[PDB]
């Protein structure tokens, strides 16, 4: 597990010298932006089950071979396994949102994930269709402002669209 605080450590440790005051001022964004991190993950996990079930009707909208008989998402145990894996990405995404760096998602979600779809028979590239069909609902729920005072959280949001884009590209 890594952080934006500890990757800076390990970048400085492999150099092996004290951190500069130029370095810490750039890190002082994060203690200011920690006000902005801490609720965008709280926005996602509050509406976590709404994202999954709405995007379960989006991969299954476009590719109706999955509930076709003989499909790979066909039977009830297989379809319950789809929902078992439809939000196993969202916890690993929201871990990387809170940590701020994707080294948690890359050794627990994507490390060898592509290998099993070549082993089981389930289509790898179809999961990459539905995963970035989550992010338009994930950004679209996180972007809108209700109650919370307006702020420029767009820069942080790009990060959120980057983590779904990383996880979708390394599956298919």
């Amino acid at each position: 597990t890594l952080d934006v605080f500890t990757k800076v450590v390990s970048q400085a440790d492999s150099r092996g010298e004290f951190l500069s005051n130029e370095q810490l001022d750039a890190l002082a964004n994060v203690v200011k932006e920690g006000n902005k991190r801490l609720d965008v993950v709280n926005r996602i996990t509050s509406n976590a089950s709404a994202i999954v079930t709405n995007a379960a009707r989006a991969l299954f909208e476009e590719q109706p071979q999955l509930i076709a008989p003989g499909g790979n998402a066909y039977t009830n145990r297989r379809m319950a396994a789809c929902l078992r894996d439809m939000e196993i990405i969202l916890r690993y995404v929201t871990y990387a949102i809170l940590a701020g760096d994707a080294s948690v998602l890359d050794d627990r979600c994507l490390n060898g994930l592509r290998e099993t779809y070549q082993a089981l028979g389930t289509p790898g590239s179809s999961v990459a269709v539905g995963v970035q069909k989550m992010k338009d609902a994930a950004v679209g729920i996180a972007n809108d402002p209700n109650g919370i005072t307006k702020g420029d959280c767009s820069q942080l949001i790009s990060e959120v669209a980057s983590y779904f884009d990383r996880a979708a590209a390394a599956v298919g």
Partner: protein, 284 residues
């Protein structure tokens, strides 16, 4: 698992109940308790009548002893040390142990650090005591529940690299874990530290293609170039065994080919001409 269970040799383990040591023993269960313990802890290597651990069996039959405390005694016993510790490396032991009691393959490098320092300062007889007195044992295996195969199911805190390395551990139902062509060396010690996860290869008879194991200097898992292709749709495919003309023509079988898209179909014929059999086609 449906339609991967018949190929990967996992349909006996998929619908297999647990032993469930009802606390008041009858004779009908306890010998079937002891048999199912010897099949997983010893890894399908057969017990002889002399090497039955007859003293240990009596204790298991008795009510006071648990399944948890009986599987410590067979692993402490020199029978388990005879097949396994006698002909194994230290990192060979940790992947075997984590197979024999927890039922998976080690997913990170941090647990191999944390077991080798405890092996030296305290010993192996307490090293097996660390695995049994662990929280990941106690959450799924009770004191009356035998160990069984935990790599396939989701197992709430799992890695997807760990699902690839469990098929690396055993080659199906027949395998007896010294029954493996890669013999005395260790398998996961290379792919633990370099943190790349190799191809799941099935056990054979169902799978035609088995010869490929992860080579010492394999090509990269993803390629960065366009691989001299008009269209950027690279494919990476792996071969079992090539019986072409000899020594100059094929210096190395089981090698992999990073191949662009418009010539994938012309090469699959070329591998089948040489005798090679395709193992895994990943995109890149």
């Amino acid at each position: 698992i449906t339609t991967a269970a018949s190929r990967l040799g996992t349909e006996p383990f998929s619908d297999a109940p647990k032993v469930e040591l009802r606390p008041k023993a009858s004779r009908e269960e306890v010998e079937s308790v002891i048999r199912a313990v010897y099949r997983h802890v010893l890894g399908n290597d057969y017990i002889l009548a002399s090497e039955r651990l007859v003293s240990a069996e009596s204790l298991l039959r008795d009510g006071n002893l648990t399944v948890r405390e009986f599987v410590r005694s067979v692993a402490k016993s020199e029978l388990y040390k005879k097949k396994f510790f006698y002909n194994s490396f230290q990192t060979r032991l940790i992947e075997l142990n984590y197979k024999h009691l927890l039922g998976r393959a080690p997913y990170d490098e941090s647990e191999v650090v944390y077991h080798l320092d405890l092996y030296q300062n305290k010993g192996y007889d307490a090293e097996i005591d660390s695995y049994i007195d662990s929280w990941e044992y106690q959450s799924n295996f009770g004191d009356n529940v035998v160990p069984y195969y935990r790599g396939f199911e989701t197992q709430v805190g799992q890695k997807t690299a760990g699902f690839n390395r469990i098929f690396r551990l055993y080659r199906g139902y027949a395998n007896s874990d010294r029954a493996q062509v890669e013999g005395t060396k260790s398998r996961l010690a290379r792919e633990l530290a370099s943190n790349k996860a190799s191809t799941i290869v099935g056990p054979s008879g169902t799978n035609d293609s088995w010869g490929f194991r992860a080579s010492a200097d394999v090509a990269p898992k993803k390629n960065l170039g366009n691989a001299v292709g008009e269209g950027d749709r690279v494919y990476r495919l792996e071969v079992t065994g090539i019986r072409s003309p000899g020594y100059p023509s094929v210096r190395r079988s089981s090698t992999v080919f990073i191949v662009p898209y418009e010539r994938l179909s012309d090469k699959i014929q070329q591998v089948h001409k040489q005798g090679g059999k395709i193992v895994s086609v990943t995109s890149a």
